[PDB]
Design a protein around this ligand. Structure first.
Ligand code: DGP
Ligand code: DGP
Length: 124
């Protein structure tokens, strides 16, 4: 019965590494986190920080979500992230991703008891 909180962690958290070490990281992780079974998800960001540090963003800078919701929050600090997005070649079910390492602020939507991230909105 996967909760939105848990779906966030499966799609976006990778606390086991400080950054993507190889150019194949997104192909391996998108598959292994189950993000290509229904379709190729076009864009997905992984965050290489502890869970507590990411959950804490829900008490940091309140901003508008891209869709106008008001329950989005931007990290005060940059975070280590991996941008995964489909390449030109990518075509379901043969998904293909480019791996880009970056240091950026994250913007997430939060909800719940506990009040935790449930959607990754953007990096800036
Ligand atoms: N839903 C969702 N959107 C993402 C995620 N990572 C980045 N984005 C969004 C932010 C931007 O709206 C868009 C990419 O835009 P750009 O970098 O300009 O091509 O993807 C993610 O993990 N989930
Ligand atoms: N609770 C909640 N879930 C959302 C929001 N936007 C997208 N989702 C859900 C739909 C999908 O199950 C999932 C997609 O993951 P993400 O890449 O984090 O947007 O997030 C939102 O604003 N609030």
């Amino acid at each position: 019965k996967e909760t939105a909180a848990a779906k966030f962690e499966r799609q976006h958290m990778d606390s086991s590494t400080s950054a993507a070490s190889s150019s194949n990281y997104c192909n391996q992780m998108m598959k292994s986190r189950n993000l290509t079974k229904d379709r190729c998800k076009p864009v997905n960001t992984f965050v290489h920080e502890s869970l507590a540090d990411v959950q804490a963003v829900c008490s940091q800078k309140n901003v508008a979500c891209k869709n106008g919701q008001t329950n989005c929050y931007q990290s005060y600090s940059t975070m280590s992230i991996t941008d995964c997005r489909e390449t030109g070649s990518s075509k379901y079910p043969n998904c293909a991703y480019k791996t880009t390492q970056a240091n950026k602020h994250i913007i997430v939507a939060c909800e719940g008891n506990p009040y935790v991230p449930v959607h990754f909105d953007a990096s800036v």
